[PDB]
Amino acid sequence: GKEFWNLDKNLQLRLGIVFLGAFSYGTVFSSMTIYYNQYLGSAITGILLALSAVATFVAGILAGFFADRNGRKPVMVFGTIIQLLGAALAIASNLPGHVNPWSTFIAFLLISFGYNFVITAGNAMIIDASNAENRKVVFMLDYWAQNLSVILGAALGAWLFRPAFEALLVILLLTVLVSFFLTTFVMTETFKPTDNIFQAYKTVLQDKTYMIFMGANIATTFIIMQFDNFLPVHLSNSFKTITYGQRMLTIYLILACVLVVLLMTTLNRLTKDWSHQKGFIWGSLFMAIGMIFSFLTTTFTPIFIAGIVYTLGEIVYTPSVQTLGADLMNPEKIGSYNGVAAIKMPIASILAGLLVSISPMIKAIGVSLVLALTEVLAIILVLVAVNRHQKTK
């Protein structure tokens, strides 16, 4: 909190923008599958969400490059303009009595795209206006702001999603505006280069030390991808109802976000002068242990505790990995590096989903072995990467 007021103006805007972004995500985007399922098929909803994910990954790659090629600010400003167009069109597509789902999909496809521009470039900018001393503070403040805001979003969302959709859309447009003005007027450019998209990425992919870290990061973000692919299947398939797996899985998310909001500062106090190599390993250890405990148990009391363990790990892990990457990052090609960092979520997700296809054969005990084993791999790759980088001092 006190740290926030002593930061660079640009970084403060970054926190503001992500706050608003996450809030609006919570309220509207969390419940968009409900919307799509209602108006379109579940075959359609699945195809739609697949396209949006591919769309946003491509947004991230383009934003990463253009953040390096031109400045960070133009890209960010472009993103907000895209968002305005999407938000306005989504408002006009959801008029009561004249609700157009397909139009709303396209509008939301725009908003997601526009948002990842502001995110991808914003990440590059975080590195630009940060020094090695305050970098971790920024990353955690970022991470904290998002969690608190997704909760506030979720609360308002539940109350008004079904009754007053348009109200949220109006609010979404208004948050986009706030963010747009901020990005245009208040924000100052942080990077001046001294290009070819393939050549821009070829260099980052040729960075073996970063690529190793990327592989480690994919394995630790693979554990997070559990909520997306194997925690629901587990609970829906075999959760003992207490006077409802999908309802329990929902609790877990709420619990975790609440725990981050509350224990951020506290757990940070204990980890204040830890190495990033350490934080990654302790975080990625508790995260794997928490998931394994959840997978092997089907009762409320153990799962709830198991969830507490995972969140302990996630809180430490998140800022530590985010700083480690920045240190391994080339100062001239930060944008391209953040672009490459987009691949961690789809790959970690695809593998977790692919793993879930074989879930019935191997079962919970079998699944956990694969998690533990891949987490051990993450530890190996982080040490390899940190070691190689340490030389470059």
Ligand X SMILES: CCCCCCCCCCCCO[C@H]1O[C@H](CO)[C@@H](O[C@H]2O[C@H](CO)[C@@H](O)[C@H](O)[C@H]2O)[C@H](O)[C@H]1O
Ligand Y SMILES: CCOc1ccc(-c2nc3ccc(-c4nc5ccc(N6CCN(C)CC6)cc5[nH]4)cc3[nH]2)cc1
Ligand Z SMILES: CCCCCCCCCCCCCC(=O)OC[C@H](COP(=O)([O-])O)OC(=O)CCCCCCCCCCCCC
At closest approach, how far in Å is the CB of 65 from ligand Y?
19
> Which of 55, 88, 134, 227 touches ligand Y (CB under 6 A)?
227
86 or 232: whose CB is closer to ligand Y?
232
Task: Please say whether the beta carbons of 296 and 365 come within 8 A.
Answer: yes
Rounded distance, CA 218 to CA 225, Å? 10
103 or 203: whose CB is closer to ligand Z?
103
Q: Kindly state the tokens that stand for 208.
A: 């073996």
At closest approach, how far in Å is the CB of 386 from ligand Y?
25
At closest approach, how far in Å is the CB of 16 from ligand Z?
12
Residue 158 touches which member of ligand X, ligand Z, ligand Y, none, C-beta under 5-8 Å by kind: ligand X
Residue 179 interacting with ligand Y (CB under 6 A)? no
DSSP labels for 26-55?
Answer: HHHGGGHHHHHHHHS-HHHHHHHHHHHHHH
Residue 127: closest CA among 80, 72, 181, 77: 72
Residue 13: closest CA among 235, 156, 179: 179
> Which of 34, 47, 50, 58 touches ligand Y (CB under 6 A)?
50
Residue 54 touches which member of ligand Z, ligand X, ligand Y, none, C-beta under 5-8 Å by kind: ligand Y
Which residue ranges make up the site for ligand X (CB under 6 A)? 30, 33, 49-50, 53, 150-151, 154-155, 158, 227-228, 232, 250, 253-254, 257, 349
Residue 130 touches which member of ligand Z, ligand Y, ligand X, none, C-beta under 5-8 Å by kind: none
Residue 231 interacting with ligand Y (CB under 6 A)? no
259 or 281: whose CB is closer to ligand Y?
259
Rounded distance, CA 318 to CA 136, Å? 10
- Outline where the chain has alpha helix (H): 2-5, 9-28, 32-39, 42-69, 72-93, 101-128, 135-160, 165-181, 197-206, 208-224, 226-229, 231-238, 245-271, 276-296, 300-328, 334-340, 344-357, 359-391
Residue 119 touches which member of ligand Y, ligand Z, ligand X, none, C-beta under 5-8 Å by kind: ligand Z
Residue 346 interacting with ligand Y (CB under 6 A)? yes
Which residue ranges make up the site for ligand Z (CB under 6 A)? 21-22, 24-25, 29, 52-53, 56, 83, 92-93, 95, 98, 100, 102-103, 111-112, 115-116, 119, 146, 150, 175-176, 345
Residue 46 interacting with ligand Y (CB under 6 A)? no
SS3 96: coil
CB atoms within 10 A of CB 150: 25
- Alpha-carbon distances of 313 from 58, 189, 218, 259, 371, rounded to whole Å: 30, 35, 16, 11, 15
Contacts with ligand Y by CB under 6 A lie at: 50, 53-54, 57, 147, 224, 227-228, 253, 256-257, 260, 314, 345-346, 349-350
